[PDB]
Amino acid sequence: EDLLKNLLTMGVDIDMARKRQPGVFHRMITNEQDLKMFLLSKGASKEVIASIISRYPRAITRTPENLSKRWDLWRKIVTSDLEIVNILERSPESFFRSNNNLNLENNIKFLYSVGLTRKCLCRLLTNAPRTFSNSLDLNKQMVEFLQAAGLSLGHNDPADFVRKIIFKNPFILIQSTKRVKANIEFLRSTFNLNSEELLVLICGPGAEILDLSNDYARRSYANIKEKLFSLGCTEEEVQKFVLSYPDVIALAEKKFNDKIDCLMEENISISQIIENPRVLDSSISTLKSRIKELVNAGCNLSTLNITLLSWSKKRYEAKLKKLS
DNA sequence: ATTACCGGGCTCTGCCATCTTA
DNA sequence: TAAGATGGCAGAGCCCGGTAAT
DSSP states (O other), X not given: OOHHHHHHHHTOOHHHXXXXXXGGGGOSXXXXXXXXXXXXXXXXXXXXXXXXXXXXXXXXXXXXXXXXXXHHHHTTTSOOHHHHHHHHHHOXXXXXXXXXXXXXXXXXXXXXXXXXXXHHHXXXXXHXXXXXXXXXXXXXXXXXXXXXXXXXXXXXOHHHHHHHHHHHOTTXXXXXXXXXXXXXXXXXXHSOOXXXXXXXXXXXXXXXXXXXXXXXXXXXXXXXXXXXXXXXXXXXXXXXXXXXXXXXXXXXXXXHHHHHHHHHXXXXXXXXXXXXXXXXXXXXXXXXXXXXXXXXXXXXXXXXXXXXXXXXXXXHHHHHHHTO
């Protein structure tokens, strides 16, 4: 009845909203006013509230009480109201897509029961909020899948692998077990790779790899192989390089290639590059920016130690002064 | 005094398909 | 038999600085 006019006053993108959840508009009762007041109660700007609703309309169908109990359960994990406003601005659906506050509460029990610390639950929730809308069974699945993979390989107590992984890869619990499995095999296959080596890879420098979508790791490594092969890098060189800096798989193929070229267009050998993988941390902008700075003093780059291209502003800028 | 080695800190969706449920 | 609840998917880095090494 009064619905559409409210949303207009609230600043909502009504057309977008209708298309995302049309069933919300076929309802004889809605709590849009309650919700606005509630969020205003907790710090949220009028604009944010509109954005929120625009993207997840079903939000307006929750009761003040439900909202309050959920919010309080988030406060058992995050410490301030402002921290929660900010999360919801970036990810409304995670808060509003369920209304099962019992299940939420059990997740939290379960996560504690698995040995994670508040510091960690806070980390999950802040970066991977949607963890807390998973059903209990779904969070169990994954956790049991990790435990399994823990003991399937050398690790003495999976309990502590689980934590290492979840700390380093706070996005692990909202990936399918399918996806994660495949990325593990891809790793095992393509490289050495005995249980011990693999474990350290997964908990550490290549933890991101487990979150890559189906066949993306295959296809990015391929492009890495081809691109380096094309430059006279043997396969062995190629492996040592990627195992020493597995992060490089995440880059989009064009981004990797570009980077290689923009360096090498300035007469930096491929050999110089793969022997100092970390230079690829820098953005292309950071790279060319810095490349112009240096050639623009006496440096020839052909024979310079290039580690500095990926140093901090301070260490880099310091060294640049000294070179003029 | 200066570089190497290595690990940390930010990282926070939005959509579509497929069940449940009332 | 329609909404709500849930699972699952593609996407595609950068930067800083403590401490060891020299």
